[PDB]
Design an enzyme around this catalytic site. Structure first.
Site, PDB file in Angstrom:
ATOM      1  CD  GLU A 213      -3.013  -1.226   0.265  1.00  0.00           C
ATOM      2  OE1 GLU A 213      -3.126  -0.304  -0.571  1.00  0.00           O
ATOM      3  OE2 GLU A 213      -3.786  -2.210   0.301  1.00  0.00           O
ATOM      4  CG  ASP A 222      -7.895   3.385  -4.968  1.00  0.00           C
ATOM      5  OD1 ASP A 222      -8.510   3.979  -5.889  1.00  0.00           O
ATOM      6  OD2 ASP A 222      -8.397   2.445  -4.299  1.00  0.00           O
ATOM      7  CG  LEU A 234     -11.752   3.813  -0.080  1.00  0.00           C
ATOM      8  CD1 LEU A 234     -11.722   3.049  -1.377  1.00  0.00           C
ATOM      9  CD2 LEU A 234     -13.117   3.708   0.533  1.00  0.00           C
ATOM     10  CG  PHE A 306      -5.696  -4.062   4.175  1.00  0.00           C
ATOM     11  CD1 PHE A 306      -5.222  -3.240   3.158  1.00  0.00           C
ATOM     12  CD2 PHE A 306      -5.634  -3.600   5.487  1.00  0.00           C
ATOM     13  CE1 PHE A 306      -4.723  -1.973   3.444  1.00  0.00           C
ATOM     14  CE2 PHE A 306      -5.102  -2.340   5.774  1.00  0.00           C
ATOM     15  CZ  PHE A 306      -4.660  -1.533   4.750  1.00  0.00           C
ATOM     16  CB  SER A 319      -8.823 -19.007  -5.306  1.00  0.00           C
ATOM     17  OG  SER A 319      -8.733 -18.682  -6.681  1.00  0.00           O
ATOM     18  CG  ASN A 334      -8.640 -21.441 -10.510  1.00  0.00           C
ATOM     19  OD1 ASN A 334      -8.148 -22.563 -10.385  1.00  0.00           O
ATOM     20  ND2 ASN A 334      -9.597 -21.191 -11.397  1.00  0.00           N
TER      21      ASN A 334
END
Ligand code: CLR
Ligand code: OLB
Ligand code: OLB
Ligand code: OLB
Ligand code: OLB
Ligand code: OLB
Ligand code: OLB
Ligand code: OLC
Ligand code: OLC
Ligand code: OLA
Ligand code: OLA
Ligand code: OLA
Ligand code: OLA
Ligand code: JTZ
Length: 443
Positions: A213, A222, A234, A306, A319, A334
């Site tokens: 991040e 972003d 965010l 996250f 997955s 996948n």
């Protein structure tokens, strides 16, 4: 050889002397003037750069003159003095590197992680001890003539005012080599490999997300153009900066004006990481997958939640099912065939690799503090590669007695010398040093 070689060899040695001096004055001046660089580590780098500057001013020029003139024109006193300063510079350098390694070990194993447990006063006392002790082990065996060989080739050379060939007795060559170079080298290589083991081992979700991040103490858009702050926090999907500033002021609990502190960014990040983990345990699709995973793989799953949220990650039905069945490569295939991989490929690649491997190998030397550790390991590795050929051939020719030569001994010693010019270039890896250099050089 002939005139062409002597001139070309003269120019090359002049450039090496100039590069060592300029480069190390720069390093010393940068740490002396820029407060941000006045750290315990850079006090040790100052010790190192001093040894290199002394090597550049007092050793390499007299050595170069000795090669070109094929004789010693400075007398027996400067010969024994020169030899001692040279020995002091190598010993003080390698022992400083050993102190850096031990200091980085105690830091990485403490709750502080990247901060020295030493005070700048204690660090100064240790640098002074390294130099006083290495000065005693370098100047006493030479001024006391304990180093001296007893064969006539050596004895004639000691008496000949114009001879300054470093002839030693085998016990001095072994004793000085081990205490001055091999003992601190073996400790440094052993302790610093553990420093690197510890940095990789102590990687966690907070460091992993700090890497993915990044950190911004001011509002930014972003990947999707959504207003964000800190470490991927965010603020709103609303296309209004006012809306994003309101949400920021509410979240922080004060008038921010779109600017937050490191303390505030760290606080929000802890809330967000804790919400991601709680969201995983709350969700019935994510909780069984999270329970089957190991510590490293749980962090890769926290990272995903996250970034995309609990509901987002819960959409990866195949997955998640194969991660649970420990079918990492099938899970990874996948996960790549998703919008997530196309939107954020470098971050998705690191998360997918962490799931594939179960190691931190994708986040290896990604953090600023880990890049700082890598830089120090390059300083140590370059010194070793440059000095180890000389010291090995030196100890081999003490056992064997023959095939030592003169042209080989000098050449390998000059490999070591040329190392004093290398550290300033390696400091360019540090953005703090790169900034100081461009300022001092008025670039
Ligand atoms: C040729 C020989 C005799 C000269 C050796 C030079 C000596 C005096 C130099 C070499 C390295 C130097 C140290 C380099 C690092 C530091 C840390 C700095 O924050 C304060 C000064 C201090 C502690 C220096 C003191 C002087 C020092 C010990
Ligand atoms: C870097 C420092 C370089 C020193 C070069 C200056 C030294 C002078 C040049 C060497 C030379 O040509 O002399 C060889 C014979 O004439 C001896 O009698
Ligand atoms: C001696 C090494 C110092 C060289 C200067 C440097 O590398 O600084 C970075 C800038 O040139 C980038 O613009
Ligand atoms: C040649 C010998 C040494 C070269 C290194 C020069 C030594 C560096 C001098 C320190 C300085 O620049 O002063 C800054 C002041 O504000 C004090 O903080
Ligand atoms: C063996 C020679 C190594 C020399 C030991 C140097 C001490 C040090 O680097 O500091 C570690 C501190 O964190 C301990 O308080
Ligand atoms: C050119 C010389 C680079 C080799 C120095 C080294 O051994 O660095 C430690 C590495 O493991 C850092 O990745
Ligand atoms: C040896 C020749 C001396 C040239 C000095 C120079 O080029 O200035 C240094 C600049 O990099 C400063 O901006
Ligand atoms: C090829 C050239 C080789 C020249 C060799 C050495 C000169 C080193 C000097 C370069 C370092 C400049 C440091 C500086 O700008 O000093 C600022 C001053 O100290 C603020 O108070
Ligand atoms: C010739 C030897 C020149 C080396 C002596 C200069 C080193 C001193 C130094 O770097 O000072 C750091 C300063 O004291 C930190 O606060
Ligand atoms: C002749 C000796 C050659 C070089 C050493 C002197 C260079 C040091 C200048 C100091 C400038 C500064 O204050 O940073
Ligand atoms: C001397 C200080 C020893 C540092 C601990 C090293 C232990 C290790 O490498 O496993
Ligand atoms: C022994 C020869 C070279 C090792 C170079 C020294 C650098 C510290 C060791 C860290 C590492 O193992 O990667
Ligand atoms: C590669 C090493 C690069 C530069 C070092 C130059 C010094 C050469 C020393 C050998 C001289 C000699 O043959 O006696
Ligand atoms: C026996 C090798 C010499 C030595 C012993 C201890 C520490 C460093 C040593 O070697 C450094 C060399 O650069 C010295 N060079 C000679 C004096 C021309």
């Amino acid at each position: 050889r002939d005139e062409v070689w002597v001139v070309g060899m003269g120019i090359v040695m002049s450039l090496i002397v100039l590069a060592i001096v300029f480069g190390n004055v720069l390093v010393i001046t940068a740490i002396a003037k820029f407060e941000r660089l006045q750290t315990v580590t850079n006090y040790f780098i100052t010790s190192l750069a001093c040894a290199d500057l002394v090597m550049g001013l007092a050793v390499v020029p007299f050595g170069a003159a000795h090669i070109l003139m094929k004789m010693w024109t400075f007398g027996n006193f400067w010969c024994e003095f020169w030899t001692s300063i040279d020995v002091l510079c190598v010993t003080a350098s390698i022992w400083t590197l050993c102190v850096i390694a031990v200091d980085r070990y105690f830091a990485i194993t403490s709750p502080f992680k990247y901060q020295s447990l030493l005070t700048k006063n204690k660090a100064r006392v240790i640098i002074l001890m390294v130099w006083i002790v290495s000065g005693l082990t370098s100047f006493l065996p030479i001024q006391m003539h304990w180093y001296r060989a007893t064969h006539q080739e050596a004895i004639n050379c000691y008496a000949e005012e114009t001879c300054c060939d470093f002839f030693t007795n085998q016990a001095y060559a072994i004793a000085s080599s081990i205490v001055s170079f091999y003992v601190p080298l073996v400790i440094m290589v052993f302790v610093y490999s553990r420093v690197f083991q510890e940095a990789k081992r102590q990687l966690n979700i907070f460091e992993m997300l700090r890497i993915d991040e990044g950190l911004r103490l001011k509002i930014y858009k972003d990947t999707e153009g959504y207003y964000t702050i800190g470490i991927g926090h965010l603020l709103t999907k609303s296309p209004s900066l006012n809306a994003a500033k309101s949400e920021l002021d509410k979240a922080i609990g004060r008038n921010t004006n779109g600017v937050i502190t490191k303390d505030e960014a760290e606080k929000l990040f802890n809330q967000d990481v804790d919400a991601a983990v709680r969201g995983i345990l709350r969700n019935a699709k994510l909780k069984p997958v999270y329970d089957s995973l190991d510590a490293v793989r749980r962090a890769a799953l926290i990272n995903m939640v996250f970034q995309m949220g609990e509901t987002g990650v819960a959409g990866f039905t195949n997955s998640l099912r194969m991660l649970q069945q420990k079918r990492w490569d099938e899970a990874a295939v996948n996960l790549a065939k998703s919008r997530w991989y196309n939107q954020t490929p470098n971050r998705a690649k690191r998360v997918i690799t962490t799931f594939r491997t179960g190691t931190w190998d994708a986040y290896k030397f990604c953090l600023k503090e880990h890049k700082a550790l890598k830089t120090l390991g390059i300083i140590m590795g370059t010194f070793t590669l440059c000095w180890l050929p000389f010291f090995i051939v030196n100890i081999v020719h003490v056992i064997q007695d023959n095939l030592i030569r003169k042209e080989v001994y000098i050449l390998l010693n000059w490999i070591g010398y040329v190392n004093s010019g290398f550290n300033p270039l390696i400091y360019c890896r540090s953005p703090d040093f790169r900034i100081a250099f461009q300022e001092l050089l008025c670039l």
